[PDB]
């Protein structure tokens, strides 16, 4: 029964998920002056040409665009990663106001939203096995700021009316996630966790330096979604973000000078 409200939100999660107070929790604040350039970091390899999107789902916490991950069709490699990570889904976190919504922050700055492209390490065979491993997942995080529209996002925005409430899904084939990327693949990276329960410490975080711009109308449509199921009292799906957690014994590395 976890969520983002006053009575079931991030301050409560530790009671059911004690790893909430663990040693490598996400998100974190990225202090740009303390992050260290790591010249040994390889360029990111984002191979999304054969990506096969299937469906979009309102799961009551966010919406997921799901992909076929039964073959190496859309994969993330390189950077800090060893091996091949398959794209399984992407989703967003966003705010009720343009000045909040991201999970990671940059020098304590909050963006309007944050895109998470979730990948799992193919050496573990399936996603459920991968989340039980310290190097099981790689999540590519991309900040959203409000300004110009992101044309590659509009197909997502267009379909949200059909998945307004928890448990609703719709066909979402032939979507190209490459249209959601910024120009630069410069990034920060650190070892972390899922940012929602069960908060498993299985994620290599790769957070892009360059935000994408989306329009006020695009993010407004995110905010019309519902946490609730159909026929239940309406609760707008907004502020579905976890705040920054203590960095503890971790260093954030930068791919760029
Ligand atoms: C054991 C099954 C866990 C399901 N949990 C999915 C999931 C994926 C990504 C993220 S995030 N927000 O860290 O990218 C959270 C939760
Ligand atoms: Na505008
Ligand atoms: Zn997320």
Swiss-Prot record:
Activity regulation as described: Activated by X-ray, histamine, L-adrenaline, L- and D-phenylalanine, L- and D-histidine, L-His-OMe and beta-Ala-His (carnosine).
Entry-linked InterPro entries: CA_dom, CA_dom_sf, Carbonic_anhydrase_a-class, Carbonic_anhydrase_a-class_CS
Pfam families: Carb_anhydrase
Keyword Phosphoprotein: yes
The record's free-text note on cofactor binding: Zinc. Can also use cobalt(II) with lower efficiency, but not copper(II), nickel(II) and manganese(II).
Impact reported for residue 195 to S/V: Reduced activity
Reported impact of residue 89 to P: In OPTB3; in Czechoslovakia
Effect of residue 103 to A/Q: Strongly reduced CO(2) hydrase activity
Marked site: Fine-tunes the proton-transfer properties of H-64: 4, 59, 64
Binding sites annotated in the UniProt record for Zn(2+): 91, 93, 116
Impact after mutating residue 194 to E/H/R: Strongly reduced CO(2) hydrase activity
Keywords: Acetylation, Cell membrane, Cytoplasm, Disease variant, Lyase, Membrane, Metal-binding, Osteopetrosis, Phosphoprotein, Zinc
UniProt note: pH dependence: Optimum pH is 6-8.
Compartments reported by the entry: Cytoplasm; Cell membrane
Binding site for substrate: 195-196
EC number per UniProt: 4.2.1.1, 4.2.1.69
Effect on the protein upon substituting residue 198 to A: Normal CO(2) hydrase activity, but impaired stability
Consequence the record notes for mutating residue 59 to D: Strongly reduced activity
Highest rank taxon of the organism: Eukaryota
Additional note from the record: Target of drugs used in treatments against glaucoma disorder and breast cancer.
Family statement: Belongs to the alpha-carbonic anhydrase family.
Subunit field text: Interacts with SLC4A4. Interaction with SLC4A7 regulates SLC4A7 transporter activity. Interacts with SLC26A6 isoform 4 (via C-terminus cytoplasmic domain).
Related illness: Osteopetrosis, autosomal recessive 3: A rare genetic disease characterized by abnormally dense bone, due to defective resorption of immature bone. Osteopetrosis occurs in two forms: a severe autosomal recessive form occurring in utero, infancy, or childhood, and a benign autosomal dominant form occurring in adolescence or adulthood. Recessive osteopetrosis commonly manifests in early infancy with macrocephaly, feeding difficulties, evolving blindness and deafness, bone marrow failure, severe anemia, and hepatosplenomegaly.
Protein name: Carbonic anhydrase 2
């Amino acid at each position: 029964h976890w969520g983002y409200g006053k009575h079931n939100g991030p301050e409560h999660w530790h009671k059911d998920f004690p790893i909430a107070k663990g040693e490598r929790q996400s998100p974190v604040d990225i202090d740009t002056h303390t992050a260290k350039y790591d010249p040994s970091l390889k360029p990111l390899s984002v191979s999304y040409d054969q990506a096969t999107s299937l469906r979009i789902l309102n799961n009551g916490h966010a919406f997921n665009v799901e992909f076929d991950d039964s073959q190496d069709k859309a994969v993330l490699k390189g950077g800090p990663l060893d091996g091949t990570y398959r794209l399984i889904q992407f989703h967003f976190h966003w705010g009720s106001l343009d000045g909040q919504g991201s999970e990671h922050t940059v020098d304590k700055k909050k963006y309007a939203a944050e895109l998470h492209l979730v990948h799992w390490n193919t050496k573990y065979g399936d996603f459920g096995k991968a989340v039980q491993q310290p190097d099981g997942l790689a999540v590519l995080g991309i900040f959203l700021k409000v300004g110009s529209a992101k044309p590659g996002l509009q197909k997502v925005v267009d379909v949200l009316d059909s998945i307004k409430t928890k448990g609703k899904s719709a066909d979402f084939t032939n979507f190209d996630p490459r249209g959601l990327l910024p120009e630069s693949l410069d990034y920060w990276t650190y070892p972390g966790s899922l940012t929602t329960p069960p908060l498993l410490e299985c994620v290599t975080w790769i957070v892009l330096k360059e935000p994408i711009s989306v329009s006020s109308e695009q993010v407004l449509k995110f905010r019309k979604l519902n946490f609730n199921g159909e026929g239940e009292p309406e609760e707008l799906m907004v502020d579905n973000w976890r705040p920054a957690q203590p960095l503890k014994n971790r260093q954030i590395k930068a791919s760029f000078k």
